[PDB]
Amino acid sequence: EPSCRFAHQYTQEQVLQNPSKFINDVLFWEGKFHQNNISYNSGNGMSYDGTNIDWVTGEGTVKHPFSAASKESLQVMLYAHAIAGSADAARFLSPNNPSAAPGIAASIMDTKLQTYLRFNETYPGFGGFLPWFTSSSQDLTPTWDWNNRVPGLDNGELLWAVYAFIQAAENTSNKSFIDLAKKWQTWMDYTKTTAAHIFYQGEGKVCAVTDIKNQSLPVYHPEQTYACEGTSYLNDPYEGELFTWWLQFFGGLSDADIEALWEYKRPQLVSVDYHIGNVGPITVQKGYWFSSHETWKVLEMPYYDIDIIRRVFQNAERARTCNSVVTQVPGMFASINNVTDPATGDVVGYISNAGIPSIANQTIQELDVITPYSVFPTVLFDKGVGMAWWRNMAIGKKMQNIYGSTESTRRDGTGVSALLTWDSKVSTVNAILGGVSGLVSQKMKAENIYNTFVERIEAEYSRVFKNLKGEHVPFCLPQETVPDTGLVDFTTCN
Ligand SMILES: *[C@@H]1O[C@H](CO)[C@@H](O)[C@H](O)[C@H]1NC(C)=O
Numbered sequence: 001e002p003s004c005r006f007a008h009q010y011t012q013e014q015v016l017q018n019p020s021k022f023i024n025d026v027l028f029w030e031g032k033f034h035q036n037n038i039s040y041n042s043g044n045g046m047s048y049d050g051t052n053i054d055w056v057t058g059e060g061t062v063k064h065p066f067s068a069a070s071k072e073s074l075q076v077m078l079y080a081h082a083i084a085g086s087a088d089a090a091r092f093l094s095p096n097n098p099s100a101a102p103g104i105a106a107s108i109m110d111t112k113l114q115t116y117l118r119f120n121e122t123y124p125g126f127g128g129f130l131p132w133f134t135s136s137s138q139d140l141t142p143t144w145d146w147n148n149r150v151p152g153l154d155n156g157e158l159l160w161a162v163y164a165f166i167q168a169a170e171n172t173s174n175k176s177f178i179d180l181a182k183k184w185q186t187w188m189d190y191t192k193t194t195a196a197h198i199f200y201q202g203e204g205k206v207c208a209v210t211d212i213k214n215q216s217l218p219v220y221h222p223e224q225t226y227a228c229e230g231t232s233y234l235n236d237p238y239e240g241e242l243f244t245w246w247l248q249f250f251g252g253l254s255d256a257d258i259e260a261l262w263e264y265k266r267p268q269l270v271s272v273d274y275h276i277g278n279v280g281p282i283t284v285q286k287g288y289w290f291s292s293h294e295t296w297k298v299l300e301m302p303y304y305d306i307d308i309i310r311r312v313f314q315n316a317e318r319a320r321t322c323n324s325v326v327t328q329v330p331g332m333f334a335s336i337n338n339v340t341d342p343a344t345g346d347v348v349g350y351i352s353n354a355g356i357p358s359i360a361n362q363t364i365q366e367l368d369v370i371t372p373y374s375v376f377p378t379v380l381f382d383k384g385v386g387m388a389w390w391r392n393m394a395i396g397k398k399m400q401n402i403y404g405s406t407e408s409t410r411r412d413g414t415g416v417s418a419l420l421t422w423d424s425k426v427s428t429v430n431a432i433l434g435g436v437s438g439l440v441s442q443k444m445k446a447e448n449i450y451n452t453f454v455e456r457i458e459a460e461y462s463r464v465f466k467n468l469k470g471e472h473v474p475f476c477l478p479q480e481t482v483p484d485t486g487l488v489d490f491t492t493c494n
């Protein structure tokens with residue numbers, strides 16, 4: 001029912017007055033991203049990173065034929081909600097027939113698993129993990145750059161997503177769905193047997209990227225070797241922390257090695273105070289860039305069951321929203337694709353370093369490009385405020401399309417990334433659905449690792465964050481709009 005260009009059909013206050021109505025429109029159009037040759041390959045059930053859309057028409061043109069376990073995790077998390085019978089996930093997957101959404105998720109995940117297993121057979125050296133892959137043909141291949149290279153961070157995200165999906169499928173008591181869950185449990189369980197050998201160097205050091213001698217050789221072939229790429233380790237509180245937990249619970253590490261994981265991580269967990277103009281001080285967890293993307297872990301594991309953690313991450317959103325108000329930015333910041341050059345149709349590059357410099361490890365930042373998915377952590381705390389920010393960016397010229405929100409816009413409104421990706425779109429969807437931490441905590445409790453998670457993560461956070469300021473500072477609403485400088489809405493979405 002909703003118009004493609006629904007964002008400017010609402011006022012800001014109307015979004016706050018009824019977030020659910022607005023979200024219902026959001027989910028409908030976000031759902032249109034979920035099509036063959038747009039966001040995934042229906043032949044092998046594998047994600048594509050996304051696709052370019054035509055500068056003028058806003059229709060799919062040039063797909064990204066590659067993806068990674070990180071995008072897989074967004075797709076899988078959605079399917080976890082869909083198979084559990086979530087009405088919102090159904091709005092996304094199957095709006096004209098909600099009752100079919102579980103079956104669609106089940107079918108694709110069946111097809112997907114087959115593809116994962118063919119990849120494992122052909123490339124056993126990955127030990128059941130996924131590199132960046134080409135998904136445009138029936139069988140997966142590593143992208144050229146990712147031959148014999150496997151990232152811990154991305155796989156950590158996928159593994160907890162699959163963990164959630166398994167629980168969701170089994171919660172249905174549908175024997176078909178339970179059988180599917182058990183096959184996925186086998187896939188997931190295999191990674192437990194290889195994780196430490198592939199990614200754990202020792203003394204609490206976990207490879208960010210592991211270099212494989214030869215991906216064609218089995219994990220324990222007499223010639224096979226694994227080594228960390230350089231001295232980049234998963235040692236910080238951002239997305240890589242999901243993989244830390246994988247090693248801890250399932251990797252077969254000693255108690256001394258588990259202690260070493262958290263000890264080596266401790267110096268990267270830091271309390272800092274945001275304070276600009278009359279906003280703050282607000283005590284936050286120091287970010288890498290304080291890109292929204294860095295908070296991803298809270299959607300996969302029940303971090304927010306711990307009050308000190310919930311309070312620290314709530315503070316993040318006080319800082320994030322109000323920072324944009326005080327610096328007069330009509331959106332918020334996250335790692336994102338740069339604008340499209342209209343003459344070529346090509347994205348001009350990728351902007352990793354977009355966040356909030358004053359509360360970041362990396363202070364050298366590009367802040368000319370804003371993105372709707374920057375709201376996903378705000379959405380977890382306050383759907384209304386999250387969606388108000390989302391709306392403010394989506395009303396920018398060309399920032400809605402027939403597949404939902406557009407990747408990104410310049411904050412001065414002189415350029416747009418004419419692109420769709422899972423990262424810029426379905427991150428937000430998964431935040432709207434409340435993450436999968438609920439499903440995960442159920443399975444964690446059943447497998448008696450929940451109490452360990454809570455004890456450990458409360459200890460680590462409570463040791464650093466002792467004297468919170470700014471907890472009285474309300475979330476801020478957008479005060480500036482994206483300038484209209486002559487860009488024209490897509491002809492299929494105006
Ligand atoms: C992956 O391949 C290895 C080695 O051929 C095999 O032992 C393992 O069972 C496979 N993984 C799964 C989940 O079937």
Ligand SMILES: *[C@@H]1O[C@H](CO)[C@@H](O)[C@H](O)[C@H]1NC(C)=O
Binds near residue numbers: 214215216217
């Ligand atoms: C990697 O192992 C495969 C499988 O035996 C072998 O055929 C291939 O030549 C190896 N690659 C290199 C560069 O040694």
Ligand SMILES: *[C@@H]1O[C@H](CO)[C@@H](O)[C@H](O)[C@H]1NC(C)=O
Binds near residue numbers: 338339348350352415
């Ligand atoms: C993004 O594009 C702008 C021009 O629109 C350019 O000045 C900037 O350096 C680009 N950044 C990246 C990281 O590609």
